[PDB]
Protein backbone atom coordinates (compact mmCIF):
# COMPACT_ATOMS: atom_id res chain seq x y z
CA UNK A 1 0.00 0.00 0.00
CA UNK A 2 1.37 3.55 -0.83
CA UNK A 3 2.65 5.51 1.60
CA UNK A 4 1.52 8.88 2.76
CA UNK A 5 4.49 9.60 4.56
CA UNK A 6 6.48 9.74 1.09
CA UNK A 7 3.49 11.41 -0.37
CA UNK A 8 3.67 13.84 1.67
CA UNK A 9 7.19 14.80 1.67
CA UNK A 10 6.43 14.76 -1.92
CA UNK A 11 4.19 17.84 -1.05
CA UNK A 12 6.80 19.48 0.92
CA UNK A 13 5.97 18.51 4.47
CA UNK A 14 8.36 16.72 7.02
CA UNK A 15 6.17 13.66 8.14
CA UNK A 16 3.16 11.58 8.45
CA UNK A 17 3.52 10.02 11.85
CA UNK A 18 2.23 7.80 14.27
CA UNK A 19 1.76 6.71 17.76
CA UNK A 20 2.99 3.27 19.32
CA UNK A 21 5.05 1.64 21.55
CA UNK A 22 7.22 -1.40 22.06
CA UNK A 23 4.04 -4.25 22.60
CA UNK A 24 2.43 -2.37 19.11
CA UNK A 25 5.96 -3.10 17.70
CA UNK A 26 6.22 -6.62 18.62
CA UNK A 27 2.51 -7.71 17.94
CA UNK A 28 0.18 -7.32 14.95
CA UNK A 29 1.04 -6.04 11.59
CA UNK A 30 2.09 -2.36 13.64
CA UNK A 31 5.75 -2.65 12.09
CA UNK A 32 5.32 -3.97 9.11
CA UNK A 33 2.88 -0.70 8.81
CA UNK A 34 5.48 1.60 10.16
CA UNK A 35 8.28 0.54 8.03
CA UNK A 36 6.40 1.21 4.96
CA UNK A 37 3.94 3.94 5.38
CA UNK A 38 4.91 6.32 8.38
CA UNK A 39 7.86 8.91 8.91
CA UNK A 40 8.23 9.59 12.65
CA UNK A 41 7.02 7.59 15.36
CA UNK A 42 5.69 9.03 18.67
CA UNK A 43 4.93 7.46 22.22
CA UNK A 44 1.82 6.26 22.84
CA UNK A 45 2.51 5.53 26.65
CA UNK A 46 5.91 5.26 27.60
CA UNK A 47 7.08 9.00 27.68
CA UNK A 48 4.48 9.92 30.48
CA UNK A 49 5.13 11.48 33.32
CA UNK A 50 3.36 8.53 35.98
CA UNK A 51 5.25 5.55 32.94
CA UNK A 52 8.76 7.71 33.40
CA UNK A 53 9.12 9.14 37.25
CA UNK A 54 6.61 6.90 39.34
CA UNK A 55 8.00 8.25 42.61
CA UNK A 56 10.75 10.74 42.87
CA UNK A 57 13.85 10.59 41.08
CA UNK A 58 13.04 6.80 40.32
CA UNK A 59 13.01 7.12 36.43
CA UNK A 60 12.06 4.43 34.23
CA UNK A 61 13.21 4.62 30.91
CA UNK A 62 13.22 0.66 29.64
CA UNK A 63 10.12 1.11 27.45
CA UNK A 64 11.02 4.90 25.63
CA UNK A 65 14.59 3.22 25.10
CA UNK A 66 13.08 0.79 22.96
CA UNK A 67 11.18 3.08 20.60
CA UNK A 68 14.09 5.23 20.57
CA UNK A 69 16.19 2.70 19.63
CA UNK A 70 13.44 1.31 17.16
CA UNK A 71 13.20 4.16 15.50
CA UNK A 72 16.75 5.35 14.94
CA UNK A 73 17.73 1.65 13.07
CA UNK A 74 14.63 2.40 10.66
CA UNK A 75 15.25 5.65 9.60
CA UNK A 76 12.34 7.37 11.76
CA UNK A 77 11.74 10.43 13.27
CA UNK A 78 11.06 10.73 17.14
CA UNK A 79 8.87 12.84 18.80
CA UNK A 80 8.26 12.90 22.60
CA UNK A 81 6.25 14.14 25.79
CA UNK A 82 4.35 14.90 27.86
CA UNK A 83 7.22 16.49 29.61
CA UNK A 84 4.51 18.74 31.96
CA UNK A 85 1.01 17.62 31.92
CA UNK A 86 -1.76 17.35 34.75
CA UNK A 87 -3.21 13.92 33.51
CA UNK A 88 -1.48 10.71 34.42
CA UNK A 89 0.52 12.61 37.28
CA UNK A 90 1.85 10.90 40.15
CA UNK A 91 0.77 11.69 43.29
CA UNK A 92 4.02 12.71 44.90
CA UNK A 93 4.21 15.64 42.48
CA UNK A 94 0.73 16.74 43.30
CA UNK A 95 0.82 16.74 46.92
CA UNK A 96 3.73 19.18 46.53
CA UNK A 97 3.32 22.72 47.79
CA UNK A 98 6.61 24.24 48.10
CA UNK A 99 7.26 26.57 44.94
CA UNK A 100 11.42 25.97 45.22
CA UNK A 101 11.02 22.26 45.42
CA UNK A 102 8.14 21.54 42.25
CA UNK A 103 10.35 24.29 40.25
CA UNK A 104 12.96 21.88 40.83
CA UNK A 105 10.97 18.69 40.42
CA UNK A 106 9.62 19.76 36.92
CA UNK A 107 12.84 21.49 35.92
CA UNK A 108 14.99 17.93 36.78
CA UNK A 109 12.29 15.94 35.07
CA UNK A 110 12.49 18.02 31.73
CA UNK A 111 16.11 17.88 32.10
CA UNK A 112 16.32 14.14 32.49
CA UNK A 113 14.21 13.22 29.69
CA UNK A 114 15.64 15.71 27.19
CA UNK A 115 19.22 14.95 28.23
CA UNK A 116 19.37 10.91 27.93
CA UNK A 117 17.76 11.37 24.14
CA UNK A 118 19.55 15.05 23.14
CA UNK A 119 19.71 15.02 19.42
CA UNK A 120 17.88 12.57 19.11
CA UNK A 121 14.07 14.19 18.72
CA UNK A 122 12.62 16.27 16.65
CA UNK A 123 10.47 18.01 18.85
CA UNK A 124 9.27 17.33 22.27
CA UNK A 125 5.76 18.39 23.77
CA UNK A 126 7.33 20.34 26.64
CA UNK A 127 3.44 21.59 28.25
CA UNK A 128 0.14 19.88 27.30
CA UNK A 129 -3.31 20.60 28.14
CA UNK A 130 -2.71 23.90 30.34
CA UNK A 131 -5.84 26.11 29.38
CA UNK A 132 -9.46 25.41 30.39
CA UNK A 133 -11.99 26.09 27.75
CA UNK A 134 -12.54 29.32 28.47
CA UNK A 135 -9.42 29.79 27.52
CA UNK A 136 -8.15 31.19 30.96
CA UNK A 137 -4.89 28.64 32.19
CA UNK A 138 -6.38 25.66 33.99
CA UNK A 139 -5.18 25.73 37.60
CA UNK A 140 -3.05 22.72 37.87
CA UNK A 141 -0.75 22.23 40.54
CA UNK A 142 1.77 24.02 38.52
CA UNK A 143 0.07 27.05 37.83
CA UNK A 144 -0.91 27.06 41.78
CA UNK A 145 2.44 26.75 43.26
CA UNK A 146 4.79 28.13 40.71
CA UNK A 147 2.50 30.81 38.93
CA UNK A 148 2.81 32.08 35.15
CA UNK A 149 5.80 31.98 35.21
CA UNK A 150 6.14 27.93 35.23
CA UNK A 151 5.41 27.91 31.37
CA UNK A 152 8.69 30.34 30.67
CA UNK A 153 10.52 28.44 32.88
CA UNK A 154 9.76 24.80 31.42
CA UNK A 155 10.42 26.19 27.61
CA UNK A 156 13.48 27.66 28.39
CA UNK A 157 14.99 24.40 30.85
CA UNK A 158 13.99 22.43 28.03
CA UNK A 159 15.71 24.88 25.29
CA UNK A 160 18.91 24.66 27.45
CA UNK A 161 18.76 20.98 27.56
CA UNK A 162 18.46 20.19 24.40
CA UNK A 163 18.95 23.26 21.85
CA UNK A 164 18.10 21.18 18.78
CA UNK A 165 14.49 19.79 19.63
CA UNK A 166 11.73 21.99 18.23
CA UNK A 167 9.58 22.99 21.43
CA UNK A 168 6.11 22.54 20.97
CA UNK A 169 2.84 23.61 23.39
CA UNK A 170 -0.40 21.78 23.25
CA UNK A 171 -3.81 21.26 23.65
CA UNK A 172 -7.03 19.88 22.32
CA UNK A 173 -10.30 21.51 21.38
CA UNK A 174 -8.54 23.76 18.99
CA UNK A 175 -10.51 22.43 16.13
CA UNK A 176 -13.02 26.22 15.25
CA UNK A 177 -11.53 29.07 14.51
CA UNK A 178 -14.82 30.62 16.84
CA UNK A 179 -13.59 28.48 20.13
CA UNK A 180 -12.59 30.58 22.74
CA UNK A 181 -9.65 28.34 23.72
CA UNK A 182 -8.27 28.68 19.97
CA UNK A 183 -7.75 32.07 19.96
CA UNK A 184 -6.36 32.56 23.84
CA UNK A 185 -3.81 29.98 22.77
CA UNK A 186 -2.47 32.07 20.05
CA UNK A 187 -2.68 34.82 22.14
CA UNK A 188 -1.23 33.98 24.74
CA UNK A 189 1.79 32.29 22.37
CA UNK A 190 2.15 35.46 20.75
CA UNK A 191 2.54 37.29 23.95
CA UNK A 192 5.20 35.04 25.41
CA UNK A 193 7.40 34.75 22.54
CA UNK A 194 7.57 38.56 21.98
CA UNK A 195 9.03 38.32 25.75
CA UNK A 196 11.78 35.68 24.81
CA UNK A 197 10.19 32.54 25.49
CA UNK A 198 11.55 29.70 23.14
CA UNK A 199 7.98 28.22 22.04
CA UNK A 200 8.32 26.82 18.58
CA UNK A 201 5.31 25.13 17.75
CA UNK A 202 1.60 24.93 18.69
CA UNK A 203 0.43 20.87 18.58
CA UNK A 204 -3.32 20.58 17.96
CA UNK A 205 -4.68 17.14 19.54
CA UNK A 206 -7.18 16.52 17.08
CA UNK A 207 -10.02 14.13 18.78
CA UNK A 208 -12.93 14.64 15.77
CA UNK A 209 -16.33 13.66 15.71
CA UNK A 210 -17.65 12.95 12.47
CA UNK A 211 -18.13 15.95 10.36
CA UNK A 212 -15.71 18.49 12.41
CA UNK A 213 -12.75 17.94 9.64
CA UNK A 214 -14.12 21.11 7.88
CA UNK A 215 -13.76 23.48 11.14
CA UNK A 216 -10.13 22.83 10.99
CA UNK A 217 -9.27 24.36 7.71
CA UNK A 218 -10.17 27.83 9.47
CA UNK A 219 -8.91 27.14 12.70
CA UNK A 220 -5.41 25.85 12.16
CA UNK A 221 -4.90 28.91 9.68
CA UNK A 222 -5.54 30.83 13.00
CA UNK A 223 -2.86 28.94 15.48
CA UNK A 224 -0.32 29.62 12.54
CA UNK A 225 -0.94 32.87 13.24
CA UNK A 226 0.52 32.98 16.66
CA UNK A 227 3.99 32.86 14.63
CA UNK A 228 5.54 30.13 16.34
CA UNK A 229 7.80 28.37 13.26
CA UNK A 230 5.81 25.36 13.46
CA UNK A 231 2.41 24.07 13.89
CA UNK A 232 1.27 20.32 14.15
CA UNK A 233 -1.69 18.29 13.74
CA UNK A 234 -1.60 15.45 16.92
CA UNK A 235 -2.97 12.21 17.88
CA UNK A 236 -5.37 12.63 15.35
CA UNK A 237 -8.41 10.51 15.01
CA UNK A 238 -11.93 10.69 13.74
CA UNK A 239 -15.20 9.02 14.98
CA UNK A 240 -16.52 7.00 12.48
CA UNK A 241 -12.97 7.70 10.06
CA UNK A 242 -15.19 9.12 7.04
CA UNK A 243 -12.98 10.25 4.03
CA UNK A 244 -14.57 13.50 4.27
CA UNK A 245 -12.74 14.34 7.65
CA UNK A 246 -9.45 12.98 6.80
CA UNK A 247 -8.66 14.31 4.10
CA UNK A 248 -9.93 18.09 5.28
CA UNK A 249 -7.67 17.62 8.16
CA UNK A 250 -4.68 16.47 5.83
CA UNK A 251 -5.71 19.73 2.99
CA UNK A 252 -5.58 22.75 6.10
CA UNK A 253 -2.15 21.12 6.92
CA UNK A 254 -1.31 21.67 3.10
CA UNK A 255 -3.02 25.31 3.18
CA UNK A 256 -0.67 26.03 6.31
CA UNK A 257 2.72 26.44 4.95
CA UNK A 258 4.36 26.46 8.80
CA UNK A 259 2.10 23.15 9.85
CA UNK A 260 4.83 20.69 9.46
CA UNK A 261 3.11 17.19 9.08
CA UNK A 262 0.27 15.12 10.83
CA UNK A 263 0.25 12.38 13.55
CA UNK A 264 -2.05 9.87 13.75
CA UNK A 265 -2.82 8.32 17.11
CA UNK A 266 -2.77 4.59 16.30
CA UNK A 267 -2.38 2.21 13.07
CA UNK A 268 -5.74 0.20 13.63
CA UNK A 269 -8.85 0.14 15.16
CA UNK A 270 -9.34 -2.34 17.60
CA UNK A 271 -6.33 -0.60 19.33
CA UNK A 272 -7.82 3.08 19.32
CA UNK A 273 -8.46 4.10 22.95
CA UNK A 274 -12.27 5.14 21.57
CA UNK A 275 -11.84 1.10 19.65
CA UNK A 276 -15.82 0.91 19.35
CA UNK A 277 -15.95 4.71 16.65
CA UNK A 278 -13.78 2.24 13.95
CA UNK A 279 -11.82 6.16 14.02
CA UNK A 280 -8.04 4.93 12.60
CA UNK A 281 -6.80 4.61 9.12
CA UNK A 282 -6.82 1.01 9.05
CA UNK A 283 -9.30 -1.77 10.26
CA UNK A 284 -9.20 -4.70 12.58
CA UNK A 285 -7.47 -6.83 9.88
CA UNK A 286 -5.05 -4.58 9.34
CA UNK A 287 -6.56 -3.57 5.71
CA UNK A 288 -6.30 0.09 4.61
CA UNK A 289 -9.57 1.56 5.20
CA UNK A 290 -11.22 4.28 2.54
CA UNK A 291 -9.89 6.99 4.64
CA UNK A 292 -6.56 5.81 3.70
CA UNK A 293 -7.28 5.11 0.31
CA UNK A 294 -8.89 8.72 0.17
CA UNK A 295 -5.81 10.86 1.29
CA UNK A 296 -3.61 8.60 -1.00
CA UNK A 297 -5.43 10.36 -3.73
CA UNK A 298 -5.86 13.81 -2.38
CA UNK A 299 -1.97 13.73 -1.80
CA UNK A 300 -1.11 12.34 -5.57
CA UNK A 301 -2.79 15.52 -7.23
CA UNK B 1 -20.97 -13.86 26.65
CA UNK B 2 -21.01 -16.36 28.75
CA UNK B 3 -17.70 -16.25 31.15
CA UNK B 4 -15.42 -19.47 30.45
CA UNK B 5 -13.56 -18.57 34.00
CA UNK B 6 -16.77 -19.09 35.85
CA UNK B 7 -17.58 -22.33 33.80
CA UNK B 8 -14.30 -23.48 34.22
CA UNK B 9 -14.42 -22.56 37.98
CA UNK B 10 -17.82 -24.79 37.86
CA UNK B 11 -15.90 -28.12 36.77
CA UNK B 12 -13.55 -27.35 39.78
CA UNK B 13 -10.31 -25.61 38.26
CA UNK B 14 -9.13 -22.82 39.33
CA UNK B 15 -9.17 -20.05 36.51
CA UNK B 16 -9.36 -19.19 32.86
CA UNK B 17 -6.83 -16.22 32.23
CA UNK B 18 -5.28 -13.69 29.55
CA UNK B 19 -1.94 -12.30 29.23
CA UNK B 20 -2.34 -8.05 29.72
CA UNK B 21 -1.18 -5.06 30.21
CA UNK B 22 -1.38 -1.25 30.79
CA UNK B 23 -1.75 -0.22 27.58
CA UNK B 24 -4.17 -3.23 26.61
CA UNK B 25 -6.79 -2.05 29.79
CA UNK B 26 -6.66 1.36 27.94
CA UNK B 27 -7.90 0.38 24.57
CA UNK B 28 -9.91 -1.23 22.79
CA UNK B 29 -12.33 -3.44 24.68
CA UNK B 30 -10.11 -5.32 26.82
CA UNK B 31 -11.04 -4.52 29.96
CA UNK B 32 -14.50 -5.61 29.88
CA UNK B 33 -14.03 -8.86 28.14
CA UNK B 34 -11.38 -9.46 31.09
CA UNK B 35 -13.57 -8.11 33.51
CA UNK B 36 -16.64 -10.65 32.48
CA UNK B 37 -15.11 -13.32 31.41
CA UNK B 38 -11.55 -14.27 32.67
CA UNK B 39 -10.28 -14.86 36.29
CA UNK B 40 -6.66 -14.34 35.95
CA UNK B 41 -4.31 -11.67 34.42
CA UNK B 42 -0.64 -12.14 33.55
CA UNK B 43 1.73 -9.59 32.41
CA UNK B 44 2.73 -9.38 28.98
CA UNK B 45 6.07 -7.44 29.08
CA UNK B 46 5.51 -5.57 32.48
CA UNK B 47 7.29 -8.11 34.58
CA UNK B 48 10.28 -9.76 32.37
CA UNK B 49 14.18 -8.64 33.11
CA UNK B 50 14.43 -5.68 30.35
CA UNK B 51 11.12 -4.14 31.35
CA UNK B 52 12.11 -4.13 35.47
CA UNK B 53 16.34 -4.54 36.17
CA UNK B 54 17.35 -2.80 33.07
CA UNK B 55 20.58 -1.82 35.28
CA UNK B 56 22.09 -3.34 37.77
CA UNK B 57 19.90 -2.99 41.25
CA UNK B 58 17.88 -0.57 39.50
CA UNK B 59 14.01 -1.25 39.46
CA UNK B 60 11.08 -0.11 37.31
CA UNK B 61 7.75 -1.55 38.50
CA UNK B 62 5.37 1.42 36.89
CA UNK B 63 3.77 -1.34 34.40
CA UNK B 64 3.88 -3.87 36.99
CA UNK B 65 2.09 -1.91 39.77
CA UNK B 66 -0.50 -0.48 37.36
CA UNK B 67 -1.08 -4.20 36.19
CA UNK B 68 -0.70 -5.84 39.90
CA UNK B 69 -3.28 -2.65 40.88
CA UNK B 70 -6.22 -3.06 38.23
CA UNK B 71 -5.98 -6.99 39.17
CA UNK B 72 -7.03 -6.31 42.73
CA UNK B 73 -9.54 -3.81 42.17
CA UNK B 74 -11.44 -6.32 39.86
CA UNK B 75 -11.46 -9.38 41.92
CA UNK B 76 -8.38 -11.06 39.70
CA UNK B 77 -6.07 -13.25 40.49
CA UNK B 78 -2.42 -12.58 39.44
CA UNK B 79 0.51 -14.18 38.13
CA UNK B 80 3.96 -13.07 37.57
CA UNK B 81 7.05 -14.36 35.17
CA UNK B 82 9.63 -14.72 33.81
CA UNK B 83 12.09 -14.44 36.45
CA UNK B 84 15.07 -16.24 34.80
CA UNK B 85 15.09 -16.77 31.36
CA UNK B 86 17.58 -15.52 28.24
CA UNK B 87 15.34 -13.41 26.09
CA UNK B 88 14.55 -10.43 27.07
CA UNK B 89 17.91 -10.60 29.28
CA UNK B 90 19.65 -6.80 29.45
CA UNK B 91 23.50 -7.08 28.11
CA UNK B 92 24.63 -6.07 31.44
CA UNK B 93 23.30 -9.53 32.78
CA UNK B 94 24.96 -11.63 29.77
CA UNK B 95 28.57 -10.45 30.09
CA UNK B 96 28.87 -11.13 33.65
CA UNK B 97 31.43 -14.20 33.88
CA UNK B 98 32.06 -14.71 37.42
CA UNK B 99 29.50 -17.11 39.17
CA UNK B 100 29.28 -15.94 42.28
CA UNK B 101 28.49 -12.32 41.16
CA UNK B 102 26.03 -13.45 38.81
CA UNK B 103 24.34 -15.77 41.44
CA UNK B 104 24.15 -12.86 43.38
CA UNK B 105 22.55 -10.44 40.69
CA UNK B 106 20.13 -13.72 40.18
CA UNK B 107 18.93 -14.05 43.56
CA UNK B 108 18.68 -9.83 43.91
CA UNK B 109 16.60 -9.77 41.02
CA UNK B 110 14.39 -12.98 42.30
CA UNK B 111 13.89 -11.48 45.88
CA UNK B 112 13.18 -7.61 44.75
CA UNK B 113 10.35 -8.99 42.62
CA UNK B 114 8.81 -11.21 44.69
CA UNK B 115 8.84 -9.08 47.53
CA UNK B 116 7.50 -6.11 46.19
CA UNK B 117 4.40 -8.39 45.78
CA UNK B 118 4.53 -10.49 48.14
CA UNK B 119 1.05 -12.60 49.43
CA UNK B 120 -0.51 -10.89 45.94
CA UNK B 121 0.93 -13.20 43.70
CA UNK B 122 -0.62 -16.66 42.73
CA UNK B 123 2.13 -18.15 40.73
CA UNK B 124 5.23 -17.08 39.58
CA UNK B 125 7.18 -18.42 36.44
CA UNK B 126 10.76 -18.39 38.14
CA UNK B 127 12.63 -20.22 35.06
CA UNK B 128 11.41 -20.31 31.45
CA UNK B 129 12.90 -22.15 28.28
CA UNK B 130 15.50 -23.61 30.23
CA UNK B 131 15.61 -26.54 27.95
CA UNK B 132 16.69 -27.53 23.72
CA UNK B 133 14.37 -29.91 21.57
CA UNK B 134 16.80 -32.34 22.46
CA UNK B 135 15.64 -32.49 25.93
CA UNK B 136 19.56 -31.18 27.38
CA UNK B 137 19.68 -28.15 29.42
CA UNK B 138 19.48 -24.86 26.94
CA UNK B 139 23.47 -23.57 27.39
CA UNK B 140 22.22 -19.98 28.84
CA UNK B 141 24.62 -17.15 30.53
CA UNK B 142 23.01 -18.58 33.96
CA UNK B 143 23.73 -22.33 32.61
CA UNK B 144 27.44 -21.20 31.29
CA UNK B 145 28.45 -19.33 34.08
CA UNK B 146 27.01 -21.04 37.73
CA UNK B 147 26.27 -24.58 36.11
CA UNK B 148 23.29 -26.20 36.42
CA UNK B 149 22.66 -25.28 40.16
CA UNK B 150 21.12 -22.11 38.80
CA UNK B 151 17.90 -23.66 38.40
CA UNK B 152 17.46 -25.46 42.29
CA UNK B 153 19.13 -22.06 43.39
CA UNK B 154 16.79 -19.87 41.89
CA UNK B 155 13.64 -21.85 43.11
CA UNK B 156 15.07 -22.13 46.47
CA UNK B 157 15.75 -18.64 46.57
CA UNK B 158 11.70 -17.55 45.44
CA UNK B 159 10.37 -20.18 47.96
CA UNK B 160 12.15 -17.58 50.77
CA UNK B 161 11.03 -14.46 48.95
CA UNK B 162 7.19 -15.50 49.33
CA UNK B 163 6.14 -18.96 50.60
CA UNK B 164 2.72 -18.32 49.75
CA UNK B 165 3.25 -17.98 45.82
CA UNK B 166 3.12 -21.33 43.78
CA UNK B 167 6.48 -21.45 42.00
CA UNK B 168 6.91 -22.98 38.09
CA UNK B 169 9.40 -24.23 35.76
CA UNK B 170 7.43 -23.17 32.05
CA UNK B 171 8.35 -24.61 28.22
CA UNK B 172 7.26 -24.70 25.01
CA UNK B 173 7.06 -27.60 22.82
CA UNK B 174 5.90 -29.94 25.46
CA UNK B 175 2.72 -30.69 23.10
CA UNK B 176 4.05 -34.29 22.48
CA UNK B 177 4.00 -37.16 24.71
CA UNK B 178 6.53 -38.63 21.99
CA UNK B 179 8.74 -35.78 21.66
CA UNK B 180 12.13 -35.81 23.79
CA UNK B 181 11.61 -32.19 25.40
CA UNK B 182 8.60 -33.51 26.86
CA UNK B 183 10.00 -36.62 28.59
CA UNK B 184 12.72 -34.34 29.36
CA UNK B 185 11.43 -32.26 31.63
CA UNK B 186 9.80 -34.50 33.34
CA UNK B 187 12.55 -36.54 33.95
CA UNK B 188 14.17 -33.30 35.30
CA UNK B 189 11.56 -31.85 37.55
CA UNK B 190 11.11 -35.76 39.35
CA UNK B 191 15.02 -35.66 39.53
CA UNK B 192 15.09 -31.78 41.20
CA UNK B 193 11.27 -32.62 43.68
CA UNK B 194 13.30 -35.84 45.01
CA UNK B 195 16.27 -33.20 45.92
CA UNK B 196 13.79 -31.09 47.99
CA UNK B 197 13.68 -28.35 45.15
CA UNK B 198 10.52 -26.40 45.18
CA UNK B 199 8.74 -26.95 41.93
CA UNK B 200 5.20 -26.52 42.98
CA UNK B 201 4.57 -26.47 38.98
CA UNK B 202 4.93 -27.44 35.32
CA UNK B 203 3.78 -24.96 32.77
CA UNK B 204 3.39 -25.94 29.10
CA UNK B 205 3.61 -22.38 26.99
CA UNK B 206 1.23 -24.09 24.28
CA UNK B 207 1.51 -22.48 20.90
CA UNK B 208 -0.04 -24.48 18.55
CA UNK B 209 -0.49 -25.51 14.60
CA UNK B 210 -3.91 -26.46 13.08
CA UNK B 211 -4.77 -29.94 14.35
CA UNK B 212 -2.04 -30.27 17.50
CA UNK B 213 -4.10 -30.19 19.87
CA UNK B 214 -5.37 -33.77 19.79
CA UNK B 215 -1.61 -34.52 21.08
CA UNK B 216 -2.00 -32.51 24.54
CA UNK B 217 -4.46 -34.87 25.52
CA UNK B 218 -1.35 -37.23 25.55
CA UNK B 219 1.22 -34.65 26.63
CA UNK B 220 -0.18 -32.99 29.58
CA UNK B 221 -0.95 -36.19 31.62
CA UNK B 222 2.60 -37.07 30.73
CA UNK B 223 3.48 -33.55 32.11
CA UNK B 224 1.84 -34.55 35.25
CA UNK B 225 3.62 -37.96 35.76
CA UNK B 226 6.52 -35.64 37.45
CA UNK B 227 4.19 -35.18 40.64
CA UNK B 228 4.03 -31.60 40.50
CA UNK B 229 1.36 -30.27 42.76
CA UNK B 230 0.12 -28.17 39.47
CA UNK B 231 0.58 -28.00 36.02
CA UNK B 232 -0.92 -25.49 33.71
CA UNK B 233 -1.52 -24.83 30.31
CA UNK B 234 -0.22 -21.22 29.32
CA UNK B 235 0.42 -17.99 26.53
CA UNK B 236 -2.29 -20.43 24.62
CA UNK B 237 -3.05 -19.74 21.08
CA UNK B 238 -3.98 -21.80 18.05
CA UNK B 239 -3.25 -20.80 14.21
CA UNK B 240 -6.48 -20.82 12.17
CA UNK B 241 -8.10 -21.06 16.03
CA UNK B 242 -10.06 -24.20 15.23
CA UNK B 243 -12.91 -24.96 18.00
CA UNK B 244 -11.19 -28.59 17.97
CA UNK B 245 -8.20 -27.62 18.41
CA UNK B 246 -9.56 -25.53 21.30
CA UNK B 247 -11.82 -27.61 22.73
CA UNK B 248 -9.36 -31.03 22.64
CA UNK B 249 -6.82 -28.57 25.07
CA UNK B 250 -9.47 -27.36 27.37
CA UNK B 251 -10.24 -31.27 27.94
CA UNK B 252 -6.73 -32.48 28.13
CA UNK B 253 -6.90 -29.49 31.23
CA UNK B 254 -9.82 -30.92 32.27
CA UNK B 255 -8.93 -34.48 32.09
CA UNK B 256 -5.88 -34.04 34.31
CA UNK B 257 -6.33 -33.49 37.85
CA UNK B 258 -3.53 -31.47 38.73
CA UNK B 259 -3.93 -29.10 35.73
CA UNK B 260 -5.32 -25.89 37.95
CA UNK B 261 -5.93 -23.60 34.71
CA UNK B 262 -5.35 -22.29 31.21
CA UNK B 263 -4.19 -18.78 29.95
CA UNK B 264 -4.55 -17.67 26.50
CA UNK B 265 -1.97 -15.13 24.64
CA UNK B 266 -4.15 -11.92 24.38
CA UNK B 267 -7.69 -11.63 23.80
CA UNK B 268 -8.40 -10.16 20.13
CA UNK B 269 -6.56 -11.59 16.85
CA UNK B 270 -4.64 -8.54 15.71
CA UNK B 271 -3.11 -8.24 18.84
CA UNK B 272 -1.50 -11.41 18.56
CA UNK B 273 2.32 -12.06 18.20
CA UNK B 274 1.19 -13.93 15.18
CA UNK B 275 -1.85 -11.68 14.27
CA UNK B 276 -1.97 -13.22 10.54
CA UNK B 277 -3.13 -16.61 11.69
CA UNK B 278 -6.02 -15.27 13.77
CA UNK B 279 -5.13 -17.43 16.59
CA UNK B 280 -7.42 -16.22 19.39
CA UNK B 281 -10.38 -16.22 20.97
CA UNK B 282 -11.97 -13.10 19.68
CA UNK B 283 -11.53 -11.46 16.46
CA UNK B 284 -10.83 -7.95 15.29
CA UNK B 285 -14.17 -6.31 16.01
CA UNK B 286 -13.97 -8.08 19.69
CA UNK B 287 -16.84 -10.69 19.22
CA UNK B 288 -15.98 -13.73 20.31
CA UNK B 289 -15.00 -16.24 17.79
CA UNK B 290 -16.35 -20.02 16.97
CA UNK B 291 -13.66 -21.54 19.37
CA UNK B 292 -14.82 -18.76 22.15
CA UNK B 293 -18.71 -20.66 22.05
CA UNK B 294 -17.28 -24.02 21.49
CA UNK B 295 -15.53 -23.91 24.83
CA UNK B 296 -18.44 -22.71 26.41
CA UNK B 297 -20.63 -25.50 25.57
CA UNK B 298 -17.65 -28.18 26.10
CA UNK B 299 -17.53 -26.33 29.78
CA UNK B 300 -21.47 -27.02 30.33
CA UNK B 301 -21.23 -30.98 28.77
O1 LIG C 1 0.87 12.78 18.21
N1 LIG C 1 0.81 11.88 18.97
O2 LIG C 1 0.10 10.74 18.70
C1 LIG C 1 1.40 11.94 20.26
C2 LIG C 1 1.33 10.83 21.11
C3 LIG C 1 1.90 10.91 22.36
C4 LIG C 1 2.50 12.11 22.77
N2 LIG C 1 3.10 12.46 23.92
N3 LIG C 1 3.53 13.75 23.79
N4 LIG C 1 3.17 14.21 22.56
C5 LIG C 1 2.55 13.20 21.93
C6 LIG C 1 1.98 13.12 20.65
O1 LIG D 1 0.26 -17.08 30.44
N1 LIG D 1 0.69 -16.16 29.88
O2 LIG D 1 0.11 -15.67 28.71
C1 LIG D 1 1.89 -15.55 30.35
C2 LIG D 1 2.33 -14.34 29.82
C3 LIG D 1 3.52 -13.78 30.27
C4 LIG D 1 4.24 -14.44 31.27
N2 LIG D 1 5.40 -14.13 31.88
N3 LIG D 1 5.66 -15.14 32.78
N4 LIG D 1 4.67 -16.07 32.70
C5 LIG D 1 3.79 -15.65 31.78
C6 LIG D 1 2.60 -16.22 31.33
Same mark, same amino acid.
Do not use: M
Given at each position: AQSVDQLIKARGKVYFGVATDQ????????????????GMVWPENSMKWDATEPSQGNFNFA?????????????????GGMLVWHSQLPSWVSSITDKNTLTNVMKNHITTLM *?? +?????? !??????????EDGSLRQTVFLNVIGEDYIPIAFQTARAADPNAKLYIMDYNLDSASYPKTQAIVNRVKQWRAAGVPIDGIGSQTHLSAGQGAGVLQALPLLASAGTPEVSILMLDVAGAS? *?? +?????? !??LNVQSCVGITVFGVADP?????????????????????????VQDLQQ
Open positions: NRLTTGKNAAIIQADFGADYLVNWAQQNGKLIG *TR +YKGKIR !AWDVVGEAFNP *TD +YVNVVN !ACDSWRASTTPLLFDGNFNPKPAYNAI
